[PDB]
Point group: C2
């Protein structure tokens, strides 16, 4: 059995989190290391 109070909202929010992570990881966090720069010659 399933409960509409918990199951449906959990599934939709989990799908929303998947979509948000897919949007973020590809573009926002892609150049997190390559664009990282420090003011030094070392």
């Amino acid at each position: 059995h399933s409960t509409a109070i918990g199951g449906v909202w959990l599934s939709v929010i989990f799908i929303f989190r998947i979509m948000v992570l897919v949007v973020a990881a590809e573009s926002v966090w892609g150049d997190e290391k390559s664009s990282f720069i420090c003011n030094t010659l070392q």
Copy 2:
């Protein structure tokens, strides 16, 4: 009049200082600024 105790030694030591400065300034201190380098990109 002159005194051999002070005048001769003063003159020879002053000439020695001139020669030492001539030797030092041309070569030793020539690249004091151009060779000065700091570990920074600023």
